[PDB]
Design an enzyme around this catalytic site. Structure first.
Site, PDB file in Angstrom:
ATOM      1  N   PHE A 138       7.938  -1.634  40.714  1.00 19.41           N
ATOM      2  CA  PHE A 138       7.586  -2.287  39.661  1.00 19.41           C
ATOM      3  C   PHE A 138       6.285  -2.702  39.769  1.00 19.41           C
ATOM      4  CE2 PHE A 138       6.887  -6.918  39.206  1.00 19.41           C
ATOM      5  CZ  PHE A 138       7.310  -7.191  37.655  1.00 19.41           C
ATOM      6  N   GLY A 153     -13.917  17.474 -38.905  1.00 16.71           N
ATOM      7  CA  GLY A 153     -13.883  18.913 -38.953  1.00 16.71           C
ATOM      8  C   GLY A 153     -12.582  19.435 -38.836  1.00 16.71           C
ATOM      9  N   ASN A 196     -18.754   0.354 -11.362  1.00 19.79           N
ATOM     10  CA  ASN A 196     -17.969   1.258 -10.642  1.00 19.79           C
ATOM     11  C   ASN A 196     -16.469   0.738 -10.368  1.00 19.79           C
ATOM     12  OD1 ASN A 196     -18.614  -0.557  -8.513  1.00 19.79           O
ATOM     13  ND2 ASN A 196     -17.623   0.839  -7.224  1.00 19.79           N
ATOM     14  N   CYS A 219     -15.074  -0.966  -8.435  1.00 20.03           N
ATOM     15  CA  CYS A 219     -14.802  -1.828  -7.680  1.00 20.03           C
ATOM     16  C   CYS A 219     -15.803  -3.149  -8.280  1.00 20.03           C
ATOM     17  CB  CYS A 219     -15.228  -1.719  -6.548  1.00 20.03           C
ATOM     18  SG  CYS A 219     -14.032  -0.595  -5.717  1.00 20.03           S
ATOM     19  N   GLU A 226     -19.064  -3.871  -8.088  1.00 19.81           N
ATOM     20  CA  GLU A 226     -20.198  -4.518  -7.220  1.00 19.81           C
ATOM     21  C   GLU A 226     -21.392  -3.592  -7.723  1.00 19.81           C
ATOM     22  OE1 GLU A 226     -18.483  -1.350  -4.141  1.00 19.81           O
ATOM     23  OE2 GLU A 226     -18.189  -2.232  -5.938  1.00 19.81           O
ATOM     24  N   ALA A 279     -12.797  -2.223   2.591  1.00 22.59           N
ATOM     25  CA  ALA A 279     -11.366  -2.029   2.958  1.00 22.59           C
ATOM     26  C   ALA A 279     -11.112  -2.017   4.504  1.00 22.59           C
ATOM     27  CB  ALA A 279     -10.755  -0.991   2.232  1.00 22.59           C
ATOM     28  N   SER A 280     -11.216  -0.739   4.930  1.00 22.55           N
ATOM     29  CA  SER A 280     -10.782  -0.456   6.172  1.00 22.55           C
ATOM     30  C   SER A 280     -11.756  -0.300   7.481  1.00 22.55           C
ATOM     31  CB  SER A 280      -9.824   0.620   6.189  1.00 22.55           C
ATOM     32  OG  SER A 280     -10.488   2.082   6.674  1.00 22.55           O
TER      33      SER A 280
END
Ligand SMILES: Nc1ncnc2c1ncn2[C@@H]1O[C@H](COP(=O)(O)OP(=O)(O)OP(=O)(O)O)[C@@H](O)[C@H]1O
Ligand SMILES: Cc1cn([C@H]2C[C@H](O)[C@@H](COP(=O)(O)OP(=O)(O)OP(=O)(O)O)O2)c(=O)[nH]c1=O
Ligand SMILES: Cc1cn([C@H]2C[C@H](O)[C@@H](COP(=O)(O)OP(=O)(O)OP(=O)(O)O)O2)c(=O)[nH]c1=O
Ligand SMILES: [Mg+2]
Ligand SMILES: [Mg+2]
Lengths: 715, 724
Positions: free
Chosen positions: A2, A251, A400, A402, A404, A578-579
């Site tokens: 162990f 038209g 856009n 988002c 910004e 975001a990520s």
């Protein structure tokens, strides 16, 4: 026995807090996966998982978790960098038999031609500098795989990006790699995914205006979206020039049915090309099909509105508001402010109106739509235009996906924009001070990457290329704001935090300009520069009527720009990051911690994560036990009711809910004065109510905010 | 009590005035049955005061109409009243109504919006005295009430809500749109129209002699290619057409299947189904303010999804299949069927029959198959789908390709919205077509024999009209304009075939109907070949002629290995074509004529009478003028016919002779429908839109009936499956 496993776990604990990170505690839950023929690769892999579950116990467990998985990755990959490259290039897919490069020949060949500097420039011990959740994010989708097996080590990935961006400029490549591997900043996902590759599509945001209020035009525009979307990009569409429901079609004698049938088609296009994947649609409030617009959503498009000041005025004065069909009332979306206000009132006076409502009715239809869905987003056309450096180019028609980015679009230009984020926590020294110099030094480097990118970027449509080439815009943003305050012991809405707020952004902006300025000294100022507010000698803060703290020397910088110009038309746009924030272990963008406790799925496992700054305080203050974790949870992540925790900690770790949205807004306004385009301002309202909301937009609009509201969060 | 008169005055109700006025327009109507005083009575039944003399007019006309039930002349008498009322309410000089339409100012908007091409009005006004006089306002009185009501609805040009054109005024403008300076030709064509020998298709009747004249309604597209770039071009392309009002067919078989790799951008393809959601959605969206037909080939991996689909706003696209020979031959012999993603097995749709099979096998032996079902599994999906929704349509690829004079431009990838049109399309070309219907009941005489000579002469006129339309037509996309000047095809068809049989006293499935059928269509191909050949002596053959089957001396019937009757001399005609060639790549295309046939009172195109009671709620004129002529029809007899959904087969005082004529389509062998369909098919260079009428359909029925029509050599072996 162990002790075999336990010691091996010990090996990877250097540096960690040993009063809380106990390794025998990992071995208890692991040693019971020990069957006769258990390949120790998967014992090891089990160990990473167990450590990550004990993250809830201390945050350095997360760090141990990472170090184990990174060990396995190391045992599993080749070390020498150019070698991983070669095999990436050499890939042959066995199903088709056909040679698939995964990296461009152009890079591989720069790589081999300079292989010795590059192979050795790489410090693989830096691989051990993410946490478990940050690392699995990379592993998931960022390190290239060959046949399911990851081949890239994060350093291999990082170095590939550096040579993507920098080609034959080696010093410059190595530099972008150090700043990168050391974690002072990061490019956005497209750049990461695609730099070095054969589809080097690197830009993130894209934004469009309808080519024409005709079918030719609608579809022409719609094919562009289709195409852009193929090279995974953010797409904004101003859509207000299109005739409304019941409007004559000369038209055919028929009548237009308005946007609702038309937006379906766009919606279907989002749904059809994915490599959920959504579009942002922009409507100005004088448009007849406004109410139905705030009705489609009460469906994989996101809505926002391009609001004229006029509308706002009428609203708080309980005035009437007119609704028009753009064909019946043309030129409305190619003018703003004073000029719009006159024109509008003039179509209004000629009885060129389709229908009239009490203004406030519209207002409260919106309020309702936000409360249900968090949308439509709120943008102030007049603020955006009034304060754009691109304003000499025309009226700016939308923004856009988002909110910004405020850039110009036309029948023949679609705006692009590449992003990077500086990691704002990385700049607080141990002396508990904010290293401002360094922050300006990284910005210069970052402005030069985004800038080089404009020239090597793969564009999905000619219109894009054309725009980007004429105006060279770049968008720099920040992550870990919240983290920087906490590390400096500042409550978010503290006055200490508020000055640091201003000053960080003076700094970023300063450095941005100063790079762009040197780049105009070298390449020359961008095409449409002559005309612009900055050529006239006006910077962002002037248009807000703000006199910056003396932290830097604006007087001199202005002179430098006066001689050379600036290579880039715009530089500054905080985005949701975001990520990428999730990999560098930072809270996401300019925002406070939503919850001091949250969760992460990692493939099939669920994890409970406490704010790490918080957890480091409470463990070391010997306060943290099982029943505490539970107590917080029961208060949706708040520490305010927990009787036995100091009031400075309570202060330091307010969730966003418990912090004042107004402040949040005032601070955004404060730093807004130093931001070219805009910033993605999510807002969070507690027990929300029409008065509590209305009051909240008006403060933002009054503050002078280009972007009043991104998403609105309810409970 | 009083009437309010036209001037607006009060006049004493004299009602014998109406009766007298009904009579005065009962010329050569059968008064054994038509009864002026009867109408007057029903009209006058509830009469309050102050009712206007325009009000009585309608109520007369609409009352005569509800008595067609009592005898069919009432349809015509009722029409006469209505035509008359119109006449009373509108300028009688043609060239003067022509000015009105052009000098038109929109009242609610202010702006001048001419209702006819100025070129046409100038041309018209330049030849006033002639053209006005040339018109015979008498021909107005030939329509039946319902037909007439039809025109009134949608064909007669309205001024501020009120109908300005008269049926002849309309006609003349149409003929001037086609003819321009050619006044000689314009009066002739006018005469034929006004005398109801043929009609042009709606688009032509709607739009001729006006601004931007969209006069044809056939458009086939091939998908540009297997790319987002392509898909969305073809799409803009379909929008453009719908705008200008087309009916569209779309070849779709080259789109990567569900799961096919996307080399460039890492992930997979979604498939046909999501992509159709786009087309369906565009089809929904742009609707002037018809629909789409989507053709797939059975080897396509996404075939089942396709079929699953309509088989219940998933729909607004109609589905059709472009069937290779191989597939049936697999289906009958219980073999295997390989499904293929075209990205992986390129070019399958750019090849046909003999070369297709070779190619498909080359893919098969290689292992470039993506799944593999037993062929019958597919068949069983195809018919379940039909049983459910009456689609997919059923076209035979290699039957369309081996028998096409357009054979030389390469493989034909699809058909049109209504399955008659067999034209080549490609990246560079969208194929258009212009249509007309010869009305076939006109050509049988009082001496009860068919006047083929006149048929052949009218056809000639139509050919010339059709050709001139190509050259002036208004194309919505350049590629259509491009395809049409190259290959110059035209699509002649017929309406009222069942009416030509009934009048000849020939029962639909009879041996004499069987032969007349052959001959009527021999005749048309013939006369068409002349006009075309002739235009070719005057104008040169069309551009893509040298290489054509016909430039090798091969006429349609030849690809069928049929030999024509000795009605026409065909050796002599070929000699003439050897010498001068022909102007148009294709000529004959029997199409659905829904509206134009409801106008001339004719039954729809080639389909037998679909019943004896149509709907209102009135009886087959033809049967009725026979029944009462023989003094056999009484009151309660409409009830009985309803009690069989329009079958006259149990009513016993009607003898077998008459029962034999008036068989509704549901007591008629579909097998025989197809046999005639093919037999005449041998003289149709394009296809024909066949509908199949099966009362209660099982698998066995549909199966055996597809294979039978396939074995026939049919190109469309099934348009819509009408089933009840
Ligand atoms: N007194 C009347 N009672 C009933 N119907 C009438 C009467 N006068 C005219 N009509 C009907 O109205 C229509 C014609 O319109 P109008 O008011 O102009 O009369 P008209 O046709 O000029 O001539 P006339 O008076 O000689 O019939 C016809 O249907 C005619 O039968
Ligand atoms: C054809 C068509 C257009 N439209 C919409 C799309 C555009 O917003 C708008 C303009 O159509 P257009 O394409 O411009 O129609 P047009 O050019 O022939 O007519 P006009 O003279 O009025 O320009 O009408 C429909 O909503 N439904 C339809 O069926
Ligand atoms: C981009 C994309 C394409 N497709 C389909 C449309 C086409 O049938 C097929 C190819 O689209 P393309 O646009 O040709 O894909 P590509 O050019 O990026 O790569 P490749 O050259 O290998 O084709 O994939 C999707 O289904 N979904 C998508 O998101
Ligand atoms: Mg009279
Ligand atoms: Mg492609």
């Amino acid at each position: 026995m162990f002790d075999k496993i336990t010691s091996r776990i010990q090996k990877l604990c250097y540096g960690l807090n040993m009063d809380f990170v106990d390794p025998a505690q990992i071995t208890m839950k692991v040693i019971q996966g020990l069957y006769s023929g258990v390949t120790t690769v998967e014992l090891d892999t089990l160990a990473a998982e167990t450590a990550a579950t004990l993250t809830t116990k201390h945050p350095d467990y997360a760090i141990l978790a990472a170090r184990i998985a990174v060990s396995n990755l190391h045992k599993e990959t080749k070390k020498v960098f150019s070698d991983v490259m070669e095999d990436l290039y050499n890939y042959i897919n066995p199903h088709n038999g056909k040679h698939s490069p995964m990296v461009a020949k152009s890079t591989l060949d720069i790589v081999l031609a300079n292989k010795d500097r590059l192979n050795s420039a790489i410090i693989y011990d830096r691989d051990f500098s993410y946490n478990y959740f940050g690392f699995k994010t990379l592993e998931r989708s960022y390190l290239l795989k060959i046949n399911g097996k990851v081949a890239e080590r994060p350093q291999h990935m990082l170095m590939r990006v550096s040579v993507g961006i920098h080609k034959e400029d080696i010093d410059a490549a190595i530099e972008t790699y150090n700043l990168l591997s050391e974690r002072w900043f990061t490019h956005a996902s497209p750049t990461l995914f695609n730099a070095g590759t054969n589809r080097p599509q690197l830009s993130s945001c894209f934004l469009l205006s309808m080519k024409d209020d005709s079918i030719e035009g609608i579809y022409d525009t719609l094919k562009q979206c289709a195409l852009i979307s193929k090279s995974a990009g953010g797409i904004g569409v101003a859509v207000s020039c299109i005739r409304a429901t019941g409007s004559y079609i000369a038209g055919t004698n028929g009548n237009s049915n308005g946007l609702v049938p038309m937006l379906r088609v766009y919606n279907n296009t989002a749904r059809y090309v994915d490599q959920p994947g959504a579009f942002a649609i922009y409507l100005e409030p004088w448009h007849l099909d406004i109410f139905e617009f705030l009705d489609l959503k009460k469906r994989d498009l996101f809505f926002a509105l391009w609001i004229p000041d006029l509308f706002m005025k009428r609203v708080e004065t309980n005035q009437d508001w007119s609704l028009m069909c753009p064909n019946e009332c043309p030129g409305l979306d190619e003018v703003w402010g004073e000029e719009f206000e006159k024109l509008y009132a003039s179509y209004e006076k000629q009885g060129r109106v389709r229908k009239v409502v009490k203004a406030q009715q519209l207002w409260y239809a919106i309020i309702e739509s936000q409360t249900e869905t968090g949308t439509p987003y709120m943008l102030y056309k007049d603020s955006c235009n009034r304060k754009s450096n691109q304003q000499n180019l025309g009226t700016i028609k939308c923004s856009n996906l988002c909110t910004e980015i405020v850039e110009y679009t036309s029948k023949d230009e679609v705006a692009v924009c590449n992003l990077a984020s500086l990691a704002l926590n990385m700049y607080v020294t141990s002396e508990h001070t904010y290293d401002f110099k360094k922050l300006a030094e990284v910005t210069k480097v970052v402005v030069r990457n985004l800038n080089k990118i404009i020239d090597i970027n793969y564009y999905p449509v000619p219109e894009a290329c054309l725009s980007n080439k004429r105006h060279r815009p770049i968008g720099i943003g920040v992550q870990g704001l919240a983290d920087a305050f906490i590390l400096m012991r500042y409550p978010f809405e503290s006055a200490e935090a508020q000055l640091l707020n201003k000053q960080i952004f003076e700094t970023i902006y300063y450095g941005a300009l100063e790079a762009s300025c040197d780049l105009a000294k070298e390449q020359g100022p961008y095409e449409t520069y002559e005309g612009s507010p900055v050529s006239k000698g006006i910077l962002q803060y002037d248009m807000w009527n703000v006199t910056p703290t003396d932290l830097w020397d604006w007087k001199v910088l202005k002179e430098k720009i006066a001689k050379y110009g600036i290579r880039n038309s715009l530089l500054i746009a905080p985005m949701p990051t975001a990520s990428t924030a999730q990999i560098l272990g930072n809270n996401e963008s300019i925002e406070p911690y939503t919850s001091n406790i949250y969760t992460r799925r990692v493939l099939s496992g669920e994890f409970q994560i406490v704010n790490p700054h918080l957890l480091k305080d409470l463990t070391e203050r010997g306060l943290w036990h099982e029943e505490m974790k539970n107590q917080i949870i029961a208060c949706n992540g708040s520490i305010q009711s927990i009787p036995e925790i100091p009031d400075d900690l309570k202060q330091l770790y307010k969730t966003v809910w418990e912090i004042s949205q107004k402040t949040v807004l005032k601070m955004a306004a404060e730093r807004g004065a130093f931001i070219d385009q805009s910033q993605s301002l999510n807002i969070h309202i507690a027990e929300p109510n029409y008065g509590k909301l209305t009051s909240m937009h008006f403060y933002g609009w009054k503050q002078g905010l280009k972007t009043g509201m991104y998403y609105l969060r309810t409970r």
